[PDB]
Each structure stands twice: as structure tokens, then as C-alpha cells.
Amino acid sequence: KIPVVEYFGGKKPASVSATSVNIIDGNQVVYEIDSELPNKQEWLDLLAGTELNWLQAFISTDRIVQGSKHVSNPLHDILTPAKHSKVTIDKKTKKLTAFENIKGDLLPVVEIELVKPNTIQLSLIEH
């Protein structure tokens, strides 16, 4: 009967229903930002979701471990809301992909995936 969670700690996962997210369902749920931007913390909480998983950890936690040093999470600054930006999150694999406008075309710039059972790959794409 003990509740089972992936990890225990940090801020409790939050359910955020905000504007400028334009959530649409599918194989990868897509959040799209219009001209007006949402709150940064609300946007990050929405991307993290209500389920304690690896992506919830990798977005929600405000620190990462570089060797033996606690450094600020760069994912907050990377995923900060942007005008005309899209973000697709897979329901099953929990893979995140951030799309931004380049030369008038929507192209991916951030991929976050689980390559191995305990390794998270964050890939910054330059076109």
C-alpha cells in the first residue's frame, strides 16, 4: 500500500492550467506559445507535469550535480518561454522536444530523451 514514486524530494509536482500554452493531445502532447508569453514557473511546472518521473526531476529540480558542485539547472533558462515556440512531450517515452522559429520555419532546438535506464541525454541542435 506504500505509494511508489520515481524519486522523493524537491518541490511537489504541480498541475498548471495556464494561457499561452495551447495544449493539444496525441502521441506527443504539444504546447504552443502565442505572441503573449506565460509565467516562467508555470510553464516549467506544466512541462514537468504531475507525475514524478525522470523528466519531472530534470525540469523541476533547481540544481544539478557537476562533479561535487551544485550548479543552477540550465534547463530553466533553456525552456524559458519564447514567442511562437512549440514543445512536444511524448506520453510513453517522456521524450521532450522544443521547436523554435529559424528563418521562418519551425525546427527543433532541444531534445531531452532517456538513452539508457538511468542516463538522460540533453541535445542542443544548431541548424
Partner: protein, 191 residues
């Protein structure tokens, strides 16, 4: 929530008990003032992580990401790096006491040893004495420098007194800590 149906007046400063207006209040949102139930709001529950380890779910345990048991900073006992590193490696919050340190160089050397000996990602708490101005004067800059350098100083504890609001907010905003520990000794310090 107690509502005094016998008297009509503006709600108290703390909003602790209602007045006659609350019984007749009508609004589109239909919101009403509630009161907290400490038991159901603060039951010490249990949570199991994916690795099977079981923790006592609580506010403190959530904040620390660890069990709700800590070792408070002791000037003879927790000054030494061995006990601090051992407690952190065992997985319980502990405070390195600055009572047995007198220079930023000595304190930084001790923190370096602790960081090198603990597991990656394990924070460190630091305990300072408010009655001692010298230790704070050379320690607060040290904590700020170590934090902006990226050290795992997870928290700072102030014992033998509580700082004022203006010093406290400086500690919160400048040092970049996860949480600030304070040790009141009386209801005035609790206030």
C-alpha cells in the same frame, strides 16, 4: 472555522474567526474561508522510491529529499569533518559547526575535505552563532563565495539567536541557499 453570528464587524487581522457577514456572503466564485486541520494536513506518511528505499514523507523530508532526522551543529562534535561526512554519506542532514573554526581559510579547507569525501549531489549545512560577530563576519562572505563558486552548501543555520528581518532577507536572497535554519529560544524569537 468559528463565525460570530451575534456580531457584525470586519474580519480580524489574522482572519481567525468569521463574523455575521460570512454567513450571508454570496459571490460568483462561491468561495468561503476555511481553517486548517493539522492532523490530516500533516500526517507523517511513507513514500517508496523507484529503488525500493522507503522514506518518511513529511515537509522536512520533502525539503531535504531525505529522512526527517538531522544532526544539529555542535562546536566540539560536528566541527570535525569525519562525523559530517559520515552522516551525509549515511544520508541524514548534518550541520558543520563554525564554533571550532576561526578563519575563512580553515573553514574552506574543512568544507573542501567534506565535499571531497561525501557522495556527489549531497548538500552540506553550516551552523553559525549569532552572539559571535567575528565568526559570522568571516563566514557569511565565505558561504556566499562558496555558493557562487558552486559548492554544495545546502543551508545555513543560525543558533543562539535569530537575525532581524533585514539581515534575514539578505541571507535568503544573496547566499542562494535552499533553506535557512534558525534556532529560537523563546516566543519572541519564534515571532
Amino acid at each position: 472555522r468559528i463565525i460570530l453570528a451575534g456580531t457584525l464587524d470586519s474580519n480580524p487581522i489574522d482572519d481567525e474567526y468569521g463574523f455575521k457577514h460570512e454567513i450571508f456572503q454570496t459571490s460568483a466564485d462561491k468561495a468561503i474561508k476555511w481553517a486548517p486541520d493539522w492532523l490530516k494536513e500533516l500526517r507523517p506518511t511513507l513514500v517508496k522510491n523507484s529503488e525500493g528505499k522507503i522514506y518518511v514523507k513529511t515537509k522536512f523530508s520533502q525539503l531535504l529529499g531525505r529522512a526527517p532526522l538531522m544532526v544539529a551543529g555542535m562546536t566540539p562534535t560536528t566541527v570535525n569533518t569525519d562525523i559530517v561526512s559520515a552522516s551525509l554519506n549515511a544520508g541524514y542532514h548534518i550541520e558543520l559547526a563554525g564554533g571550532g573554526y576561526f578563519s575563512p581559510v580553515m573553514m574552506t579547507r574543512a568544507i573542501d575535505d567534506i565535499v571531497s569525501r561525501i557522495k556527489p549531489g549531497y548538500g552540506l549545512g553550516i551552523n553559525l552563532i549569532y552572539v559571535n560577530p567575528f565568526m559570522l563576519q568571516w563566514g557569511i562572505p565565505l558561504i556566499k563565495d562558496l555558493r557562487e563558486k558552486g559548492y554544495p552548501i545546502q543551508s545555513l543555520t543560525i543558533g543562539a539567536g535569530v537575525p532581524s528581518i533585514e539581515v534575514a532577507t539578505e541571507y535568503i536572497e544573496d547566499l542562494g541557499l535552499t533553506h535557512l535554519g534558525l534556532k529560537p529560544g523563546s516566543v519572541d524569537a519564534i515571532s
